[PDB]
Amino acid sequence: SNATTDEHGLVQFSINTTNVMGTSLTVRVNYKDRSPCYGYQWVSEEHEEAHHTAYLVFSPSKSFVHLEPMSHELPCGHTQTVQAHYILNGGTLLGLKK
Amino acid sequence: EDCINRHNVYINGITYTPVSSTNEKDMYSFLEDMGLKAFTNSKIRKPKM
Ligand SMILES: *[C@@H]1O[C@H](CO)[C@@H](O)[C@H](O)[C@H]1NC(C)=O
Ligand SMILES: *[C@@H]1O[C@H](CO)[C@@H](O)[C@H](O)[C@H]1NC(C)=O
Protein backbone atom coordinates (compact mmCIF):
# COMPACT_ATOMS: atom_id res chain seq x y z
CA SER A 1 0.00 0.00 0.00
CA ASN A 2 2.01 2.94 -1.33
CA ALA A 3 1.91 6.26 0.52
CA THR A 4 3.63 9.64 0.42
CA THR A 5 5.51 11.79 2.92
CA ASP A 6 3.30 14.57 4.23
CA GLU A 7 4.91 17.91 5.04
CA HIS A 8 3.73 17.68 8.66
CA GLY A 9 3.35 13.88 8.81
CA LEU A 10 5.60 10.94 8.02
CA VAL A 11 4.44 7.54 6.76
CA GLN A 12 1.99 6.12 9.32
CA PHE A 13 1.10 2.76 7.82
CA SER A 14 -0.57 -0.50 8.79
CA ILE A 15 -0.45 -3.92 7.16
CA ASN A 16 -3.04 -6.63 7.83
CA THR A 17 -1.31 -9.84 8.93
CA THR A 18 -2.89 -13.23 8.29
CA ASN A 19 0.32 -15.27 8.38
CA VAL A 20 3.17 -16.74 10.41
CA MET A 21 5.53 -15.50 13.11
CA GLY A 22 8.47 -14.58 10.88
CA THR A 23 7.85 -11.27 9.10
CA SER A 24 10.11 -8.64 7.54
CA LEU A 25 9.27 -5.25 6.06
CA THR A 26 10.97 -2.61 3.93
CA VAL A 27 10.30 0.50 1.82
CA ARG A 28 12.01 1.69 -1.35
CA VAL A 29 11.34 -1.94 -2.16
CA ASN A 30 11.98 -2.01 -5.91
CA TYR A 31 14.29 -4.96 -5.08
CA LYS A 32 16.02 -6.77 -2.21
CA ASP A 33 19.53 -6.19 -3.59
CA ARG A 34 20.33 -3.84 -6.47
CA SER A 35 21.48 -6.33 -9.11
CA PRO A 36 24.37 -8.25 -7.52
CA CYS A 37 25.75 -9.91 -10.63
CA TYR A 38 29.19 -8.94 -9.30
CA GLY A 39 31.17 -6.07 -7.91
CA TYR A 40 34.62 -7.70 -7.66
CA GLN A 41 35.13 -5.22 -4.78
CA TRP A 42 35.52 -2.29 -7.22
CA VAL A 43 32.70 -0.12 -5.79
CA SER A 44 29.06 -0.79 -4.83
CA GLU A 45 26.21 1.63 -5.57
CA GLU A 46 24.32 1.56 -2.27
CA HIS A 47 21.39 3.85 -1.48
CA GLU A 48 19.65 3.57 1.88
CA GLU A 49 16.69 1.23 2.30
CA ALA A 50 14.93 0.78 5.64
CA HIS A 51 14.34 -2.97 5.87
CA HIS A 52 13.05 -4.30 9.20
CA THR A 53 12.65 -7.81 10.57
CA ALA A 54 10.17 -8.49 13.37
CA TYR A 55 8.96 -11.54 15.28
CA LEU A 56 5.86 -12.73 17.09
CA VAL A 57 4.44 -13.06 20.56
CA PHE A 58 4.68 -16.79 21.30
CA SER A 59 1.08 -16.72 22.53
CA PRO A 60 -0.55 -20.19 22.40
CA SER A 61 -3.64 -18.43 23.77
CA LYS A 62 -3.42 -15.90 20.89
CA SER A 63 -5.02 -13.38 23.30
CA PHE A 64 -2.88 -10.32 23.92
CA VAL A 65 -2.77 -6.52 24.09
CA HIS A 66 -0.58 -4.37 21.84
CA LEU A 67 0.86 -1.17 23.32
CA GLU A 68 1.95 1.52 20.88
CA PRO A 69 5.14 3.34 21.92
CA MET A 70 4.86 6.92 23.16
CA SER A 71 8.29 7.75 21.74
CA HIS A 72 7.57 11.44 21.21
CA GLU A 73 7.68 14.58 23.33
CA LEU A 74 6.67 14.33 26.99
CA PRO A 75 5.93 17.18 29.42
CA CYS A 76 6.68 16.13 32.98
CA GLY A 77 4.60 16.71 36.11
CA HIS A 78 1.59 15.28 34.30
CA THR A 79 -0.29 12.06 33.68
CA GLN A 80 -0.47 10.25 30.36
CA THR A 81 -3.28 7.90 29.39
CA VAL A 82 -1.48 5.12 27.54
CA GLN A 83 -3.20 3.95 24.35
CA ALA A 84 -3.51 0.16 24.16
CA HIS A 85 -5.68 -2.03 21.93
CA TYR A 86 -6.20 -5.75 22.49
CA ILE A 87 -7.97 -8.92 21.40
CA LEU A 88 -9.39 -12.11 22.88
CA ASN A 89 -9.12 -15.09 20.52
CA GLY A 90 -11.89 -17.65 20.60
CA GLY A 91 -13.75 -15.03 22.58
CA THR A 92 -13.49 -16.18 26.14
CA LEU A 93 -13.87 -19.94 26.31
CA LEU A 94 -15.71 -19.80 29.63
CA GLY A 95 -14.39 -16.55 31.11
CA LEU A 96 -16.55 -14.76 33.65
CA LYS A 97 -18.31 -11.42 34.05
CA LYS A 98 -14.94 -9.76 34.76
CA GLU B 1 -1.19 -33.38 -10.97
CA ASP B 2 -2.63 -32.51 -7.57
CA CYS B 3 0.12 -30.65 -5.68
CA ILE B 4 -1.11 -29.56 -2.24
CA ASN B 5 2.35 -28.15 -1.40
CA ARG B 6 1.89 -24.74 0.24
CA HIS B 7 4.49 -21.98 0.26
CA ASN B 8 4.79 -22.49 3.99
CA VAL B 9 2.83 -25.49 5.21
CA TYR B 10 0.26 -23.37 7.11
CA ILE B 11 0.40 -25.75 10.09
CA ASN B 12 -1.77 -23.70 12.43
CA GLY B 13 -2.06 -24.42 16.14
CA ILE B 14 0.81 -24.39 18.63
CA THR B 15 3.66 -24.63 16.11
CA TYR B 16 4.58 -25.03 12.46
CA THR B 17 6.34 -28.00 10.85
CA PRO B 18 7.34 -28.86 7.25
CA VAL B 19 5.83 -31.19 4.67
CA SER B 20 6.84 -34.84 4.25
CA SER B 21 5.75 -37.88 2.28
CA THR B 22 3.55 -40.36 4.13
CA ASN B 23 3.79 -44.15 4.28
CA GLU B 24 0.47 -46.03 4.23
CA LYS B 25 -1.65 -48.30 2.06
CA ASP B 26 -3.99 -47.02 -0.65
CA MET B 27 -6.94 -48.19 -2.73
CA TYR B 28 -4.69 -47.50 -5.72
CA SER B 29 -2.15 -49.77 -4.05
CA PHE B 30 -4.85 -52.34 -3.29
CA LEU B 31 -5.66 -52.60 -7.00
CA GLU B 32 -1.94 -52.56 -7.83
CA ASP B 33 -0.85 -55.45 -5.61
CA MET B 34 -4.12 -57.04 -6.67
CA GLY B 35 -2.51 -56.84 -10.12
CA LEU B 36 -5.14 -55.01 -12.19
CA LYS B 37 -5.70 -51.42 -13.32
CA ALA B 38 -8.79 -49.23 -13.35
CA PHE B 39 -10.20 -45.88 -14.47
CA THR B 40 -12.45 -43.84 -12.17
CA ASN B 41 -12.93 -40.20 -11.12
CA SER B 42 -13.38 -40.74 -7.37
CA LYS B 43 -10.53 -40.24 -4.90
CA ILE B 44 -8.52 -43.47 -5.09
CA ARG B 45 -4.88 -42.43 -4.71
CA LYS B 46 -3.72 -40.34 -1.79
CA PRO B 47 -3.12 -36.64 -2.57
CA LYS B 48 0.65 -36.90 -2.94
CA MET B 49 1.96 -33.35 -3.21
C1 LIG C 1 -1.43 4.08 -4.00
O1 LIG C 1 -2.52 3.62 -3.20
C2 LIG C 1 -3.71 4.34 -3.51
C3 LIG C 1 -4.79 3.99 -2.49
O2 LIG C 1 -5.48 2.80 -2.89
C4 LIG C 1 -4.15 3.97 -4.92
O3 LIG C 1 -5.36 4.65 -5.24
C5 LIG C 1 -3.07 4.35 -5.92
O4 LIG C 1 -3.39 3.80 -7.20
C6 LIG C 1 -1.70 3.83 -5.48
N1 LIG C 1 -0.67 4.49 -6.26
C7 LIG C 1 -0.04 3.85 -7.24
C8 LIG C 1 1.44 3.68 -7.05
O5 LIG C 1 -0.62 3.43 -8.22
C1 LIG D 1 -6.07 -7.58 10.33
O1 LIG D 1 -6.70 -6.44 10.91
C2 LIG D 1 -8.01 -6.80 11.36
C3 LIG D 1 -8.79 -5.54 11.71
O2 LIG D 1 -8.98 -4.76 10.52
C4 LIG D 1 -7.86 -7.75 12.53
O3 LIG D 1 -9.15 -8.12 13.03
C5 LIG D 1 -7.09 -9.00 12.08
O4 LIG D 1 -6.84 -9.86 13.20
C6 LIG D 1 -5.78 -8.62 11.40
N1 LIG D 1 -5.17 -9.78 10.79
C7 LIG D 1 -5.87 -10.87 10.50
C8 LIG D 1 -6.77 -10.77 9.30
O5 LIG D 1 -5.77 -11.89 11.16
Side-chain angles (χ1 to χ4, degrees), chain B residues 19-37:
Chain B
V19 293
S20 54
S21 75
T22 190
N23 196 358
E24 52 181 320
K25 180 58 78 81
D26 190 286
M27 176 57 75
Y28 189 67
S29 170
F30 279 131
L31 269 67
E32 279 176 302
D33 59 1
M34 170 50 50
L36 70 88
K37 191 171 280 187

Side-chain angles (χ1 to χ4, degrees), chain A residues 15-82:
Chain A
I15 53 172
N16 225 135
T17 189
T18 316
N19 60 3
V20 311
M21 61 89 78
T23 182
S24 187
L25 295 70
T26 192
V27 189
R28 199 189 274 176
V29 67
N30 51 2
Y31 45 70
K32 299 289 104 169
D33 198 315
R34 270 81 203 176
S35 74
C37 51
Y38 53 88
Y40 57 97
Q41 298 73 42
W42 182 254
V43 66
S44 88
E45 172 47 278
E46 196 277 322
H47 304 263
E48 211 290 330
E49 62 93 26
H51 161 264
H52 173 84
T53 178
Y55 293 98
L56 202 80
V57 67
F58 205 99
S59 170
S61 76
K62 321 291 154 194
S63 76
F64 35 81
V65 56
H66 179 258
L67 281 87
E68 290 280 15
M70 306 295 105
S71 307
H72 62 114
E73 68 277 17
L74 189 156
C76 192
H78 270 97
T79 187
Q80 177 53 237
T81 180
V82 178

